[PDB]
Design a protein around this ligand. Structure first.
Ligand SMILES: *[C@@H]1O[C@H](CO)[C@@H](O[C@@H]2O[C@H](CO)[C@@H](O[C@@H]3O[C@H](CO[C@H]4O[C@H](CO[C@H]5O[C@H](CO)[C@@H](O)[C@H](O)[C@@H]5O)[C@@H](O)[C@H](O[C@H]5O[C@H](CO)[C@@H](O)[C@H](O)[C@@H]5O)[C@@H]4O)[C@@H](O)[C@H](O[C@H]4O[C@H](CO)[C@@H](O)[C@H](O)[C@@H]4O)[C@@H]3O)[C@H](O)[C@H]2NC(C)=O)[C@H](O)[C@H]1NC(C)=O
Ligand SMILES: *[C@@H]1O[C@H](CO)[C@@H](O)[C@H](O)[C@H]1NC(C)=O
Ligand SMILES: *[C@@H]1O[C@H](CO)[C@@H](O)[C@H](O)[C@H]1NC(C)=O
Ligand SMILES: *[C@H]1O[C@H](CO)[C@@H](O)[C@H](O)[C@@H]1O
Ligand SMILES: Oc1cccc(O)c1
Ligand SMILES: [Cu+2]
Ligand SMILES: [Cu+2]
Length: 371
């Protein structure tokens, strides 16, 4: 007897999520029992990682931020590292990978190939980590992902008093206004304290309402990563009731992906936008450059988990479900996304791949589950 309606207590909504996760696990292992049970990988909550396991993942990311970039210098003058290769492709394709029929599948392929770079070029042998927003929604500063310790993705940025609010515009919908959080400047501590963003900004929202952008966001612009942790954003968008509501109240792929990213004109930015903007800073508030924030990978692990749960609740109808076009909010208009639509990650990793081969975590190149 699966839940059918999200509960309003955090604690009960948390148990609903575990139960839906358990069901999705059962369905995926059954379809696997070449992806086999023996080589089925498990992705896990960052809280399940030991201190050594956390440090092994962080070290591999740091390795990727030193190894030289494969992107041709003339196509992206500012790229220096393999990590930059992933940021660059995301900047370059942002207009066709968000609010499109490809949004969920493209990002599944994106983070998988990031994982492959960690394993093949940086000797990583651990599990892929995800960030469970619901456990941190009441105090982001205490998240194991963001607490600033040697096992965080670094923490908060240096505090900047009396910051203006954040104003979010999209088309000519009424603006959405957010608090600026408790940071503002360069991250003060953690393993990514000396790490440099090399690309962007491309569309960086600033406290006060301004939006700054480099003339060419692919030219060299080394600078610190900035954060402004904003618990209030997670409290409104990323709580366990909000997570379960997205899963249970969405009956088709259109409503699922739209509620996740935020329905334009609803005043809500969804679990996707909520998780992004709660980091604040740079590139936390830049849609194009967001992979520059090292927590991007854990945030989209959770995005992919929530999609994988939703898929497995009715696999016959939801496994291959696609809706939307090839352009951001279909502006300008483009043909519908289908299973023959091909996507690629540029020079980041991998090669071109059709939507058909991306829809299941245990087919095509994929062989994993979430616990
Ligand atoms: C931002 O995003 C955009 C959009 O994605 C991106 O632009 C892409 O830009 C890259 C480079 O900047 C492009 O990659 C190059 O494409 C060259 C042209 O390739 C096409 O046409 C070839 C010619 O086809 C004709 O001639 C042949 C032979 O005479 C004939 O048989 C055909 O019928 C046709 O008439 C064709 O060969 C090629 O196809 C092969 O490869 C593609 C995958 O690339 C594959 O899908 C095909 O099935 C086929 O196997 C393709 O159709 C190409 O020459 C060039 O090659 C480089 O790499 C190869 C090794 O792979 C080297 O051998 C070669 O010498 C070159 O160094 C390269 O592939 C890409 O096509 C663009 N894509 C789009 C959609 O526009 C930007 O780069 C992004 N910006 C940033 C910063 O990331
Ligand atoms: C998962 O499968 C096990 C074994 O068949 C079963 O005992 C359990 O109740 C299932 N859980 C859910 C949530 O379906
Ligand atoms: C595009 O998809 C919608 C469903 O989302 C469908 O109603 C419409 O007919 C499709 N358009 C074309 C040209 O196939
Ligand atoms: C439990 O806590 C969440 C925040 O984590 C609230 O949104 C919920 O209403 C309940 O108080
Ligand atoms: O795709 C997105 C959406 C919202 C904020 C962000 O940094 C990225
Ligand atoms: Cu993206
Ligand atoms: Cu995202």
């Amino acid at each position: 007897t699966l839940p059918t309606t999200a509960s309003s207590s955090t604690a009960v909504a948390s148990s609903q999520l575990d139960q839906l996760a358990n069901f999705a696990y059962n369905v995926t292992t059954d379809s696997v029992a070449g992806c086999t049970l023996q080589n089925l990988r498990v992705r896990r909550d960052w809280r399940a990682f030991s201190k050594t396991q956390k440090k092994d993942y962080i070290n591999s990311v740091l390795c990727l931020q030193k190894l030289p970039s494969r992107t041709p210098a003339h196509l992206a003058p500012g790229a220096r590292t393999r990590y930059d290769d992933f940021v660059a492709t995301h900047i370059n394709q942002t207009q066709i990978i968000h609010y499109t029929g490809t949004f969920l599948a493209w990002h599944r392929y994106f983070i998988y190939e990031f994982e492959q770079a960690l394993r093949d070029e940086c000797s990583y042998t651990g599990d892929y980590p995800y960030w469970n927003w619901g456990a941190d929604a009441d105090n982001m500063e205490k998240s194991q992902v963001f607490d600033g310790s040697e096992t965080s993705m670094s923490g908060n940025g240096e505090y900047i008093p009396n910051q203006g609010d954040i104003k979010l515009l999209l088309g000519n919908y009424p603006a959405i206004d957010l608090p600026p959080g408790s940071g503002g400047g360069c991250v003060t501590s953690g393993p990514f304290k000396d790490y440099k963003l090399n690309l962007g900004p491309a569309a960086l929202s600033l406290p006060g309402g301004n939006m700054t952008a480099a003339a060419n966001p692919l030219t060299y612009n080394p600078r610190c990563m900035k954060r402004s942790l904003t618990t209030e954003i997670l409290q409104r968008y990323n709580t366990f009731p909000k997570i379960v509501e997205l899963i249970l109240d969405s009956d088709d792929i259109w409503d699922f992906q739209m509620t996740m990213q935020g329905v334009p004109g609803s005043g809500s930015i969804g679990v996707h936008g909520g998780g992004h903007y709660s980091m604040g800073g740079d590139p936390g508030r830049d849609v194009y450059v967001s992979p520059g924030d090292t927590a991007f990978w854990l945030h989209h692990g959770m995005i992919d988990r929530v999609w994988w749960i939703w898929q497995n609740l009715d696999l016959r109808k939801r496994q291959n479900a696609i809706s939307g076009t090839g352009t951001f909010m279909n502006n300008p208009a483009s043909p519908n996304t289908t299973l023959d639509t091909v996507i690629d990650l540029g020079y980041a990793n991998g090669g071109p791949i059709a939507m058909r081969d991306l829809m299941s975590t245990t087919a095509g190149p994929f062989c994993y589950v979430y616990l």
